[PDB]
Structure formats: C-alpha cells, structure tokens
Amino acid sequence: SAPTEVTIKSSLDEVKLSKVPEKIVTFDLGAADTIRALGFAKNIVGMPTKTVPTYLKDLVGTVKNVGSMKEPDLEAIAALEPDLIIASPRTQKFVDKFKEIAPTVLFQASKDDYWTSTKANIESLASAFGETGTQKAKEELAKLDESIQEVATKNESSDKKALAILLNEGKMAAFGAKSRFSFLYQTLKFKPTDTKFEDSRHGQEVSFESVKEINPDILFVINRTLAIGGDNSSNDGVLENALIAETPAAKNGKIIQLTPDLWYLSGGGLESTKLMIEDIQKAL
C-alpha cells in the first residue's frame, strides 16, 4: 500500500490517505463549509441536496446529489468513486455501508468543551488538504477565537439570562446549556436560565406559562419548520402569545430569531461558526 501523506482523526477509526482526497462525499454540512472556506470546494463531489441551508446553496451546482440529510443514495455514492466519505451523526446508521465504498470519517463534538473539540475536528479535516489546508485553518480559526472572546467578554459583563427554544409546528421545546445549542452557552458565554432542561436532542416541551415563569431576558428561537421548508402557519401567534410578549426578552427587543436552516441543519464549520457569531450580535 502507498505511504500515508495525510491522516484524519474523528469519532471513527483514524483514516490514513496516500494523497489529498479529491473526490469527497459529505453528509456533514459544516464540514462542507469548512472545505469550501479552505479553498477546496472543487474536491466535494457529492452532498445531499434535498435540504440545503441558503448559505451553502452555491455548492448544489458543483456536486452530485447523494440523497437527504438522513437517507443516503448508496448507488449514487459508489458511482462517484469517492476517496473520502464524511458521515454525520444523523447518518451514523449507514457508516458500515459507507466504509464498503471508501474511507469514512464522522466528526463529533463534546457538549461540554464544544469549541475545543470543534476546533480539533476542523483542524483534522483541514489537514486532509495538506499544509495549505492546515495553514488556512489556523488563520481562520484565529479570527474566530478573537470574535468569540469579544462576545464572551460582553456577556460576562451582563447578568441577563437566555432561554433557547426550538419551535416546531406550534410546539415549543427548551434546550439547556449542554445541548445541540452549546455554542451559545459553553463558548459564547450567554448565561442559561435557572431552569434545567432534560438534555434530549428534541428538548423539553414548555408551555406559555413555563416561559412566563422562567422570565428570560433573552429568548433565542430556532424555527425548525422554516429550517426544513415546512408550512410555518402552525407557528402563527406562538411568540405573540401574551405570556411570551410580556417577558423582559420580548419587551426589550431580545427575541432573537436565529437563521433557521443555518442553526438547525449546520454548524461546526469555519463558515457556519462565523455566520452564527454574526447572527447573535443583535442579542448583545
């Protein structure tokens, strides 16, 4: 076998390649956005195109469609002759099938040390593109580290408490400091409310009375329905309910409608992290 030139650590077995991969299939959209930010978008040959966040739309034309965020088209993947497949938590059930086709990685973040683990994943992926990738990632990560510190410093000067909810077909689910939205709390140092929420990936259902009682100063909202292109009519009037409209968050202009597709479908990449930080400036 040819000698190893690049190595990629992840939650899976370390992948060792004899050259930079030029035919990549990815189900991880953050990884796609990292690859593009590093200057290697041409190397991505397959991505699911059923539900693509707007910020990534221009990659649709340069890839072949390999299915949906949860359901791969294995025939389409094999036909692309990939030299690397980037799986995702959502597609972990297909990792054995992916491995039959090509070396496969799957990046996982800690819910505790979200940013250190995410940076390690970004650096590992970037190294697949040699010194050029590694150098560019160092440069871009330095800017993100500085932006993160600036946000964290502002939050550390405040005592406001922030509640984070997912809105889905008129149902509200609250999420805690260690959750799919850890970046807000662990990394950016928004402060959670005193109410702890069953750490489920779908959150804990909350009523209008619950939100009133929590009494948040900032309310982050991720609208799942909009993120996936559903009928948003079921969410009409939810945030406008008097019990939410009378929170200090609402009255003070701190209901923050986070870009739905970015936050629900992506994250963990160089560009997605940058855009996420931009999105929360109005919450400071």
Q: Which of 75, 131, 209, 236 binds Cl ion (CB under 5 A)?
A: 209
What minimum distance in Å lies between the beta carbon of 241 and Cl ion?
8
- In one-letter notation, the amino acid at residue 196 is K
Beta strand pairing status for 6-8 and 15-17?
Answer: antiparallel
Closer residue to Cl ion (CB): 173 or 270: 173
Exposure pattern of 8-30 as b/e (b: 16+ CB <10 Å)?
bbbebeebebeebbeebbbbbbb
DSSP labels, 159-184: --EEEEEEEETTEEEEE-SSSTTHII
Q: How far is CA 260 from CA 47, 115, 131, 150, in A?
A: 20, 21, 34, 24
Binding residues for Cl ion, rule CB under 5 A, total: 3
Residues in region 221-250 near Cl ion by CB under 5 A: none
From 93-101, 209-217, 233-241, 266-274, give the range in contact with Cl ion by CB under 5 A: 209-217
Nearest partner of 10 among 101, 129, 104, judged by Cα: 104
Closer by beta carbon to Cl ion, 159 or else 236: 236
Does the footprint of Cl ion cover residue 208 (CB under 5 A)?
Answer: yes
Q: Quote the least distance from Cβ 209 to Cl ion, whole Å.
A: 4
Per-residue interface string for the shown chain with Cl ion, residues 159-198, x marking contact by CB under 5 A = ----------------------------------------
| Footprint of Cl ion (CB under 5 A) | 207-209
